[PDB]
Write a protein that binds this ligand. Structure first.
Ligand SMILES: CCCCCCCC/C=C\CCCCCCCC(=O)O[C@@H](COC(=O)CCCCCCCCCCCCCCC)COP(=O)([O-])OCC[N+](C)(C)C
Ligand SMILES: CCCCCCCC/C=C\CCCCCCCC(=O)O[C@@H](COC(=O)CCCCCCCCCCCCCCC)COP(=O)([O-])OCC[N+](C)(C)C
Ligand SMILES: CCCCCCCCCCCCCCCCCCCC(=O)O[C@H](COC(=O)CCCCCCCCCCCCCC)COP(=O)(O)OCCN
Ligand SMILES: CCCCCCCCCCCCCCCCCCCC(=O)O[C@H](COC(=O)CCCCCCCCCCCCCC)COP(=O)(O)OCCN
Ligand SMILES: CCCCCCCC/C=C\CCCCCCCC(=O)OC[C@H](CO)OC(=O)CCCCCCCCCCCCCCC
Ligand SMILES: CCCCCCCC/C=C\CCCCCCCC(=O)OC[C@H](CO)OC(=O)CCCCCCCCCCCCCCC
Ligand SMILES: CC(C)CCC[C@@H](C)[C@H]1CC[C@H]2[C@@H]3CC=C4C[C@@H](OC(=O)CCC(=O)O)CC[C@]4(C)[C@H]3CC[C@]12C
Ligand SMILES: CC(C)CCC[C@@H](C)[C@H]1CC[C@H]2[C@@H]3CC=C4C[C@@H](OC(=O)CCC(=O)O)CC[C@]4(C)[C@H]3CC[C@]12C
Ligand SMILES: Clc1ccc(Cn2c(CN3CCCC3)nc3ccccc32)cc1
Ligand SMILES: Clc1ccc(Cn2c(CN3CCCC3)nc3ccccc32)cc1
Ligand SMILES: [Ca+2]
Ligand SMILES: [Ca+2]
Ligand SMILES: [Zn+2]
Ligand SMILES: [Zn+2]
Lengths: 669, 51, 669
């Protein structure tokens, strides 16, 4: 048998104390009043005694929402320590008002204060009541602060310091506490969410709590925007300066839900189709014909803007959608010329052809536009855009091409057949670089999928899955390098000269593959091409009769095949499935944020002409404050309605019924 | 029972650890009633974590 | 503007009728009583008037659970038609008892009767109250009944007939109505669930409702079994005759949940490990060593059973687990001999070797065991097992092999080299058939995965996904046949003789593939092998300079590749994913049912010896009734507890409070 006793004993209550606590629980006002009056005289009952659950009489009265018994206990001067915190957590306005007018165990940490707890409960009534007085919340220090106080607190007690910081940020990120006590609730929500996201990044632990607090701030900003009821209010909000300034700030803080607001998107769409008033209601054929017409007329629009910007055609290109169409048409003509550029080849360093002469101004315009964007935007913004990396690569390659061409033009005059050219001849390197540049230039069209409704979210999904692909590539490369090292170690003894080969061809790119694993570089290439099955099996064979060596090499090759294809590739498929399912929910918001950024990029005056043509306050504050006041009122009302539309409710109902029953029985009897 | 471990136990954490281990072993041994022993062991682990 | 009026007008109530209905809704007994007494004298208020929702005063009283006002209305002789149905649906015992003691719109169809509705509500109290009287439910006819009444009702009104049949089966399948008014609740649940499943199969519409009713009956049987509290009760239940007879009946009706009951599984496990009392608590190495020892000693156990069944070794094989081990060991030795059978080949029809002479008794034993199982079990049971099909194939092939060998032995005596043998020589056909038989014999080991905990549910999952594979194979074959027809139509003009080929080899199985699409059979084979990439591209090339024909053939081949691989194969993967996710939940129950069938197959006396050694009542009814009574009581109590542990509840609370308030105000004032 297992004897069961009380290992951690406490102080039991007497019979009279238990009876008094039972009377308090049942809500019998008369018996509780008699017990208090008798305790004043006989001192037989301790009014501050706890229960087996640790609650005192005052805590029992608070938990039952019994205001009469609460006031009766308060009038008899019972212990009140931390009772206000319990009243606030219970979210009972009457208890809070009663207690405001006036080391034991506690359910609240020592750093919790009444205003902080009210903010944690996000109860607008109690938060407003506490802010009516002079209450303050301590300022959290910098995320990476290194002052003496922060390091001293962290070293003395890391748990307490982290808990206090989390409690402070829970208090500040309260939507009700931001609705009050905040000059600009929208900007406060933006920056508070950004700081919470940064804290989530920095704090490896407590990451989920900071992430959810940041998400809560983002949702509060979105709902405040949702409360707008007219286009005038929306324009006032988005144009406020601390045009579309606040929208730009929201984009800066990655407020995807705020930007993808349907009314914000509608306003941005009206700005986007400046020229066409009825683009929303048109047939597919009409839109396609209009887009084709504007694309084919892009040089005329660019020339008209160059000559006279103030005309029906001069300023027609400054419209965002028209500007986007013209830039896309210019890039498409550039790609068409790139395709045509491959339609005498023995000249060493030939002069550029007509197609190359037409291509050159586009390349110069691309370089000039890149450096102009670099100057106008800045450094950090330029480097934050990943597409710019590709642009840089393209430009560099093109520049290299030009350089090499010039070199080949000045260093060579004779016409020698390409068969006997040097391997590192300038023309061959220039042509290879130009081909790579063509590949990258055509691949640059992916970024335009954002402008499309059907292609945008798909591109978002693929870009997000590229992260899982990158994660898997590391372990794949580790396995590939391991097996390459092993196969090269095994096979490098049987390396044969190219002369001994049947066609004087050495390597795996010959008709009969040979020396697949002779060198580490060739072993890497062989193991790569085996993924796609282009490496034949007889490459694991050697001229000598070393059948054990051939079998071991074949076994290494087979194990590599099994791992890379059966195991790693299926695991990659499973990871992609999971990630795509995870990101399918938020694809629309991500796409709309990306498309909003694309649209905003075409609102600026700079960069109007596509290549190659580019180389040739108090009242506003008062209006914003009035609109913000209206939005805050509407948001508070809506959230109260949503909250209004548990076991403690049934406990309160029972308490009310019992109190009424005792009152009636006392009045009658 | 988490409440019965909170009382009547010198070391609730060690008791929870060893009780969860024994429940997992019983789940392995008992082909039937496997789910109930698994959930009891998980409950003991959660009690230790909450403590 | 859209004018809004009442298109379907009704008869509005007067002011006094509306006031009376409001008084009834509020529960004011005094005003309702006064209104009734005044209506008796002045005839100014219609006591049977409806409301805008169609409810009368009696229906309002029933819906509020106001028994006092209900009785007051009944004492004044108000219209009571279909009020009992509303009382039953509300599941109020007091209303039902009041109404039992005593063409307008109705919420219940005309075929609904009080007992049927009570069964639909599955309320044990009301069902028992109605069964206390003499109530009956009409018998549904046969599922495929063809009597005059059924066809007449179906032709006159199919909707009404189907609705009435569904209502009757909803009534009968009520767990409370089966707990009462049923001699054998378990057998009734089994057969009722089976019949509901058959109706679901037959009725293309209403399939989901019959499926859920059948599932409900299965769950009721499982819960009744769950209520057993001792092994004596469980043995009494499972051994009842209308051993393990009721368990066999449950297996017959595909009661997977009933069979996979943990207590049923525990009893079956104790029966399964008859010899070993402590097999449950043993190490993996001990179990593996014991299994290996018993497997290696299987011939000794078989011989001991043959000589003297009554000994420590004679009856040691009759134990189910030992019998399974011996049969598995015998089959494994047979497969080992099959492997050894491939370790002079110019003899036409050679005499059988030592390995073949050892194989022959195993084949004879397999055939004898198959026919013995066919005789002992029956025809329908034998043909219902799909594995038997494979067995049949194996046996047939083996028989064919023997026949051909005999033919080749008697028809040929000379030793001619195999190079110049006929294509259809008996020896070649016999060897091909024997190889196919070996493949099938080794593949027969899949059925033993059921005996394993880790391999059982996996086999269940793969077998269930084979259905999706079969479904996809139809459309794949349609596409394959279409493209084969097209490619053959295009290419059959350029068919070349085998002599013209470089190595006198024609077809795709040559070193240089040729005539890939010349004939329909060869086109089918080429398109099949292209799925795995073994068909080279140059097969779409012809000797003539018909570049358009070659391009069109290559385009057909490429379209076939795109469809079969990119489209069809990925769709097959998606289907397999969905089906595997769907069937992962019930894998354990399916596996335990299959393993129970496997274990039961080894409980019988017949078939004890594996090949080749196989060729050398009132008191029981009273006990079952007592156990069933105990189980029914426990089940009723448990289900009532589970149900006890809506807006109408709050409406009833408000009604009670208002009635109390009116009573107090009348008593005081
Ligand atoms: C992000 C990209 C920016 C940079 C790209 C521009 C690179 C400009 C480089 C120019 C050097 C050209 C030298 C020509 C003179 C011949 C002799 C010689 O030095 O050959 C040298 C070989 O040099 C190469 O082959 C460089 C190839 C770089 C390819 C990068 C592709 C990136 C594609 C993905 C994006 C050395 O060979 P050796 O010592 O004679 O033996
Ligand atoms: C479920 C399986 C049960 C049936 C299988 C046993 C079949 C027994 C059959 C025996 C006929 C043998 C005839 C030998 C005499 C030579 C001449 C001859 O008639 O060849 C004949 C060819 O006949 C075949 O090749 C049959 C091949 C059947 C293979 C079935 C494999 C099934 C595998 C999956 C399972 C006709 O050829 P010809 O007209 O000369 O030209
Ligand atoms: C020696 C011989 C070499 C031969 C080379 C042959 C050609 C190689 C081609 C390399 C492959 C380039 C692939 C470019 C397409 C990437 C698709 C990105 C998908 C996406 O939406 O991500 C966006 C950013 O992408 C990006 O930023 C893409 C950047 C790609 C940089 C590649 C540099 C090389 C959004 O990103 P964001 O806007 O959220 O940020
Ligand atoms: C002319 C030359 C021909 C060359 C042929 C080369 C060899 C061909 C081999 C054919 C493939 C045979 C595959 C047999 C394994 C099937 C796996 C079944 C999975 C499973 O659990 O289903 C069970 C029933 O299976 C089954 O019943 C399987 C029945 C298979 C019958 C095959 C007849 C041929 C449960 O099914 P259940 O117990 O619920 O019912
Ligand atoms: C992430 C990295 C960790 C993953 C770790 C391990 C994954 C399991 C590795 C098993 C590889 C063994 C295969 C090596 C090999 O057989 O060499 C062939 C070599 C080639 O000569 O052949 C042999 O050595 C012996 C012939 C037996 C071949 C049959 C072996 C089958 C084993 C499973 C294959 C699975 C294929 C599944 C496709 C649906
Ligand atoms: C279920 C059945 C219904 C499915 C219906 C339709 C599915 C789409 C069919 C499209 C097939 C077109 C391809 C035929 C063909 O190109 O012949 C080659 C032939 C071979 O000569 O080449 C050509 O005719 C012209 C060369 C252009 C080849 C590029 C065409 C790419 C089209 C998409 C390919 C998708 C590959 C995706 C792999 C990730
Ligand atoms: C598929 C093969 C033939 C490559 C074709 C290359 C280009 C001809 C395609 C690739 C991506 C296409 C672009 C994808 C995105 C759009 C957005 C599209 O706009 C919309 O879909 C909605 C209306 C709007 O832009 O406001 C305008 C056409 C455009 C630039 C497309 C123009 C044609 C592009 C450049
Ligand atoms: C993987 C390659 C080498 C093929 C091996 C063929 C056989 C040697 C394997 C295949 C399936 C195996 C069987 C799969 C299922 C079982 C159930 C297993 O029993 C259990 O797993 C639980 C204990 C119990 O049976 O009650 C006994 C061994 C046995 C017959 C296995 C014996 C060994 C088998 C016949
Ligand atoms: Cl070699 C290259 C270099 C840079 C770039 C980047 N870049 C683009 C590309 N856009 C045009 C349609 C899809 C994205 N337009 C530009 C206009 C001005 C400056 C840079 C520009 C593309 C290609
Ligand atoms: Cl050529 C063949 C023909 C039939 C069969 C079917 N069969 C089996 C197969 N069992 C043994 C282990 C896995 C399933 N044992 C038997 C014992 C008696 C009769 C038939 C029997 C297998 C192979
Ligand atoms: Ca750029
Ligand atoms: Ca069989
Ligand atoms: Zn600091
Ligand atoms: Zn009938």
């Amino acid at each position: 048998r297992i004897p069961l006793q009380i290992v951690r004993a406490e102080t039991e209550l007497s019979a009279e104390e238990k009876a008094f606590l039972n009377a308090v629980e049942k809500g019998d006002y008369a018996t509780v009043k008699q017990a208090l009056q008798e305790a004043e005289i006989y001192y037989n009952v301790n009014i501050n005694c706890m229960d087996p659950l640790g609650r005192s009489a005052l805590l029992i009265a608070i938990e039952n929402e019994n205001l009469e018994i609460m006031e009766l206990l308060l009038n008899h001067s019972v212990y009140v320590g931390d009772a206000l915190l319990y009243a606030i957590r219970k979210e009972v306005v009457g208890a809070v008002e009663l207690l405001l007018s006036y080391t034991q165990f506690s359910e609240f940490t020592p750093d919790i204060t009444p205003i902080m707890l009210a903010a944690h409960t996000n109860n607008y009534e109690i938060i407003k009541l506490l802010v009516q007085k002079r209450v303050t919340i301590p300022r959290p220090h910098q995320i990476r602060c290194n002052c003496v106080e922060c390091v001293s607190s962290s070293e003395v007690d890391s748990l307490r310091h982290s808990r206090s910081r989390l409690n402070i940020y829970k208090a500040l990120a309260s939507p009700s506490l931001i609705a009050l006590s905040s000059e600009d609730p929208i900007l406060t929500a933006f920056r508070l969410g950004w700081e919470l996201k940064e804290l989530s990044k920095v704090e490896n632990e407590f990451k989920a709590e900071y992430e959810e607090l940041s998400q809560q701030c983002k949702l509060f900003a979105k709902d405040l925007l949702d409360q707008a009821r007219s286009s005038r209010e929306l324009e006032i909000i988005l144009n406020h300066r601390d045009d579309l300034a606040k929208l730009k700030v929201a984009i800066k803080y990655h407020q995807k839900e705020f930007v993808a607001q349907p009314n914000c998107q509608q306003l941005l769409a009206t700005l986007w189709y400046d020229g066409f008033p009825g683009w929303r209601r048109k047939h597919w054929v009409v839109k396609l014909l209009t887009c084709m017409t504007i694309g084919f007329l892009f040089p005329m629009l660019s020339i008209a803007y160059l000559i006279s910007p103030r005309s029906n055609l001069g300023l027609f290109i400054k419209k965002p959608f028209i500007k986007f169409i013209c830039h896309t048409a210019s890039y498409l003509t550039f790609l068409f010329m790139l395709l045509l550029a491959s339609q005498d080849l023995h000249v060493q360093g030939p002069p550029p052809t007509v197609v190359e002469w037409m291509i050159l101004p586009w390349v110069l315009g691309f370089i000039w536009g890149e450096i102009k964007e670099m100057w106008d935007g800045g450094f950090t913004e330029y480097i934050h855009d990943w597409w710019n990396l590709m642009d840089f690569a393209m430009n560099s390659l093109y520049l290299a091409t030009i350089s090499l061409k010039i070199v080949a033009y000045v260093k060579y005059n004779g016409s020698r057949p390409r068969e006997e050219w040097e391997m590192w001849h300038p023309t061959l390197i220039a042509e290879a670089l130009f081909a790579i540049s063509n590949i990258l230039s055509s691949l640059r069209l992916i970024s335009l999928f954002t402008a499309n409704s059907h292609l945008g979210p798909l591109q978002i999904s693929l870009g997000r899955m590229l992260l899982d692909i990158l994660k898997f590539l590391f372990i794949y490369c580790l396995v590939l390098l391991a097996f390459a090292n092993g196969l090269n170690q095994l096979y490098f003894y049987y390396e044969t000269r190219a002369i001994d080969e049947p066609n004087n061809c050495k390597g795996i790119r010959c008709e009969k593959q040979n020396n697949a694993f002779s060198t580490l570089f060739e072993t890497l290439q062989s193991l790569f091409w085996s993924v796609f099955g282009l490496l034949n099996l007889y490459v694991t064979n050697v001229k000598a009769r070393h059948e054990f060596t051939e079998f071991v090499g074949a076994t290494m090759f087979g194990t590599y095949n099994v791992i890379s294809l059966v195991v790693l590739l299926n695991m990659l498929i499973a990871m992609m499935n999971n990630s795509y399912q995870l990101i399918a929910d938020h694809a629309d918001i991500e796409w709309k944020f990306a498309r909003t950024k694309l649209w905003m990029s075409y609102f600026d005056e700079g960069g109007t002409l596509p290549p190659p043509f580019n180389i040739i306050s108090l009242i506003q504050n008062q209006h914003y404050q009035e609109v913000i006041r209206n939005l805050v009122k509407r948001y508070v009302a809506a959230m109260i309605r949503n909250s209004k539309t548990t076991e403690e409710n049934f406990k309160e109902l029972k308490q009310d019924i019992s109190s009424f029953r005792y009152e009636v029985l006392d009045l009658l009897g």
